[PDB]
Design an enzyme around this catalytic site. Sequence first.
Site, PDB file in Angstrom:
ATOM      1  N   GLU A 193       1.952   7.813  -1.541  1.00 53.89           N
ATOM      2  CA  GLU A 193       1.387   7.995  -0.208  1.00 53.89           C
ATOM      3  C   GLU A 193       0.263   6.986   0.019  1.00 53.89           C
ATOM      4  O   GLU A 193      -0.024   6.138  -0.830  1.00 53.89           O
ATOM      5  CB  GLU A 193       0.882   9.433  -0.019  1.00 53.89           C
ATOM      6  N   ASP A 218     -12.521  -3.422  -5.327  1.00 48.38           N
ATOM      7  CA  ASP A 218     -11.889  -2.189  -5.792  1.00 48.38           C
ATOM      8  C   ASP A 218     -10.961  -2.459  -6.969  1.00 48.38           C
ATOM      9  O   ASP A 218      -9.805  -2.034  -6.996  1.00 48.38           O
ATOM     10  CB  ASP A 218     -11.144  -1.491  -4.662  1.00 48.38           C
ATOM     11  CG  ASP A 218     -11.201   0.022  -4.785  1.00 48.38           C
ATOM     12  OD1 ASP A 218     -11.691   0.521  -5.826  1.00 48.38           O
ATOM     13  OD2 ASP A 218     -10.758   0.711  -3.843  1.00 48.38           O
ATOM     14  N   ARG A 236      -6.177   2.188 -11.402  1.00 51.36           N
ATOM     15  CA  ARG A 236      -5.404   2.906 -10.390  1.00 51.36           C
ATOM     16  C   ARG A 236      -4.783   1.973  -9.363  1.00 51.36           C
ATOM     17  O   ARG A 236      -3.853   2.381  -8.655  1.00 51.36           O
ATOM     18  CB  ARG A 236      -6.282   3.937  -9.669  1.00 51.36           C
ATOM     19  CG  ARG A 236      -7.070   3.373  -8.495  1.00 51.36           C
ATOM     20  CD  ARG A 236      -8.037   4.383  -7.888  1.00 51.36           C
ATOM     21  NE  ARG A 236      -9.287   3.726  -7.514  1.00 51.36           N
ATOM     22  CZ  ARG A 236     -10.384   3.728  -8.264  1.00 51.36           C
ATOM     23  NH1 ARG A 236     -10.394   4.367  -9.426  1.00 51.36           N
ATOM     24  NH2 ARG A 236     -11.475   3.093  -7.855  1.00 51.36           N
ATOM     25  N   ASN A 237      -5.267   0.732  -9.258  1.00 58.70           N
ATOM     26  CA  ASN A 237      -4.768  -0.202  -8.257  1.00 58.70           C
ATOM     27  C   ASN A 237      -3.910  -1.298  -8.875  1.00 58.70           C
ATOM     28  O   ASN A 237      -3.683  -2.341  -8.250  1.00 58.70           O
ATOM     29  CB  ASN A 237      -5.941  -0.779  -7.473  1.00 58.70           C
ATOM     30  CG  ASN A 237      -6.632   0.281  -6.659  1.00 58.70           C
ATOM     31  OD1 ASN A 237      -5.981   1.209  -6.177  1.00 58.70           O
ATOM     32  ND2 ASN A 237      -7.954   0.168  -6.506  1.00 58.70           N
ATOM     33  N   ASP A 268      -1.204  -3.584  -3.598  1.00 59.27           N
ATOM     34  CA  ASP A 268      -1.571  -3.897  -2.225  1.00 59.27           C
ATOM     35  C   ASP A 268      -3.038  -3.552  -1.979  1.00 59.27           C
ATOM     36  O   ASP A 268      -3.514  -2.488  -2.388  1.00 59.27           O
ATOM     37  CB  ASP A 268      -0.645  -3.130  -1.274  1.00 59.27           C
ATOM     38  CG  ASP A 268      -1.142  -3.119   0.148  1.00 59.27           C
ATOM     39  OD1 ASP A 268      -1.033  -4.169   0.811  1.00 59.27           O
ATOM     40  OD2 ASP A 268      -1.602  -2.060   0.617  1.00 59.27           O
TER      41      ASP A 268
HETATM   42  C1  EUW Z   1      13.000   5.798  -8.464  1.00 54.75           C
HETATM   43  C2  EUW Z   1      13.148   6.718  -7.250  1.00 54.75           C
HETATM   44  C3  EUW Z   1      12.093   7.825  -7.317  1.00 54.75           C
HETATM   45  O1  EUW Z   1      12.240   8.883  -6.707  1.00 54.75           O
HETATM   46  N1  EUW Z   1      11.027   7.550  -8.079  1.00 54.75           N
HETATM   47  C4  EUW Z   1       9.936   8.520  -8.246  1.00 54.75           C
HETATM   48  C5  EUW Z   1       8.769   7.859  -8.974  1.00 54.75           C
HETATM   49  N2  EUW Z   1       8.645   8.324 -10.364  1.00 54.75           N
HETATM   50  C6  EUW Z   1       7.933   7.482 -11.126  1.00 54.75           C
HETATM   51  C7  EUW Z   1       7.428   6.184 -11.004  1.00 54.75           C
HETATM   52  N3  EUW Z   1       7.452   5.228 -10.068  1.00 54.75           N
HETATM   53  C8  EUW Z   1       6.441   5.346  -8.990  1.00 54.75           C
HETATM   54  C9  EUW Z   1       6.260   4.080  -8.457  1.00 54.75           C
HETATM   55  C10 EUW Z   1       7.307   3.179  -8.601  1.00 54.75           C
HETATM   56  C11 EUW Z   1       7.175   1.895  -8.108  1.00 54.75           C
HETATM   57  C12 EUW Z   1       6.009   1.489  -7.462  1.00 54.75           C
HETATM   58  N4  EUW Z   1       6.011   0.215  -7.049  1.00 54.75           N
HETATM   59  C13 EUW Z   1       5.264  -0.310  -6.067  1.00 54.75           C
HETATM   60  N5  EUW Z   1       5.587  -1.573  -5.754  1.00 54.75           N
HETATM   61  C14 EUW Z   1       4.889  -2.266  -4.754  1.00 54.75           C
HETATM   62  C15 EUW Z   1       3.860  -1.623  -4.091  1.00 54.75           C
HETATM   63 CL1  EUW Z   1       2.971  -2.445  -2.847  1.00 54.75          CL
HETATM   64  C16 EUW Z   1       3.551  -0.314  -4.445  1.00 54.75           C
HETATM   65  N6  EUW Z   1       2.528   0.222  -3.757  1.00 54.75           N
HETATM   66  C17 EUW Z   1       2.093   1.458  -4.033  1.00 54.75           C
HETATM   67  C18 EUW Z   1       2.932   2.569  -3.949  1.00 54.75           C
HETATM   68  C19 EUW Z   1       2.443   3.837  -4.233  1.00 54.75           C
HETATM   69  C20 EUW Z   1       1.110   3.998  -4.594  1.00 54.75           C
HETATM   70  C21 EUW Z   1       0.269   2.891  -4.669  1.00 54.75           C
HETATM   71  C22 EUW Z   1       0.743   1.609  -4.385  1.00 54.75           C
HETATM   72  C23 EUW Z   1      -0.157   0.536  -4.484  1.00 54.75           C
HETATM   73  O2  EUW Z   1       0.082  -0.578  -4.005  1.00 54.75           O
HETATM   74  N7  EUW Z   1      -1.300   0.829  -5.144  1.00 54.75           N
HETATM   75  C24 EUW Z   1      -2.289  -0.248  -5.287  1.00 54.75           C
HETATM   76  N8  EUW Z   1       4.249   0.311  -5.423  1.00 54.75           N
HETATM   77  C25 EUW Z   1       4.950   2.389  -7.331  1.00 54.75           C
HETATM   78  C26 EUW Z   1       5.077   3.692  -7.827  1.00 54.75           C
HETATM   79  C27 EUW Z   1       6.901   6.273 -12.293  1.00 54.75           C
HETATM   80  O3  EUW Z   1       6.257   5.527 -13.031  1.00 54.75           O
HETATM   81  C28 EUW Z   1       7.400   7.564 -12.412  1.00 54.75           C
HETATM   82  O4  EUW Z   1       7.376   8.423 -13.294  1.00 54.75           O
END
Ligand code: EUW
Length: 258
Positions: free
Chosen positions: A18, A132, A136-137, A150
Amino acid sequence: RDYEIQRERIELGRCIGEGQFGDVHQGIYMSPENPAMAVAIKTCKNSDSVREKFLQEALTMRQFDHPHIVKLIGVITENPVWIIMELCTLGELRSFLQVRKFSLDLASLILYAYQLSTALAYLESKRFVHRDIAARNVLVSATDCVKLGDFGLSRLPIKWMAPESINFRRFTSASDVWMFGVCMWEILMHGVKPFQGVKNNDVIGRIENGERLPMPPNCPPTLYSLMTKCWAYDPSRRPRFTELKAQLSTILEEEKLQ
Ligand SMILES: CCC(=O)NCCNc1c(NCc2ccc(Nc3ncc(Cl)c(Nc4ccccc4C(=O)NC)n3)cc2)c(=O)c1=O
């Protein structure tokens, strides 16, 4: 060129988190050249006030091009508004380190620190202050590749902040270096947060007493020493990110030949 993507070229998939604006999904992007590509899809639950702030984050990532910073792929600007980002398949770094604690060798932990230092030396060279930096990021693209997430989804983190940021709201690349020291400690602690059980308001007093996060178990003393240099109280005495990158390169190579 054009960053607008036709919605029919995106196959939406499962949710993976989220943000300030809504859920983040993974999916598939079919373009004319290199189809089909795995992507992350940022959604926005709500307006035109929020649409404004939502898409500005995409603008922010547009200016960056580095192998260890997540790439903006494009945007869909008709409702429902979507931001298309490169997918880091393995997800958030803290969870990855916690799950794989006894499956990751030290060389991989040091590799992640080195890779992040190359991204941050790039931002320093662009005169961009991040504000930041924290585990966590960070996102995990592969077992041998991490990336700064991101910058919008990265958005006080007192327990990561330099003293001059806490005291006087000063933010420079040298205060980023302090945060990066804490990030490195988090990695070598396999995703434990700093200052667990301590109140935010008590952190600056401990720093000013000379106290510091301790050496993580099994951390090479040369690498912990590098962390403590990031936590010099005077920001002018901290290394620049380009120096951290050079020192991390030698620590990495001594642990494992690249
Ligand atoms: C496979 C289908 C399914 O249902 N999977 C359920 C997930 N179960 C599990 C995992 N994968 C979670 C997960 C997987 C891939 C990402 N890749 C990603 N890529 C690019 C951006 Cl830009 C991004 N952004 C972000 C997205 C969310 C939060 C923050 C950012 C961010 O940017 N924070 C700086 N996040 C981020 C989080 C585990 O590990 C684990 O267990």
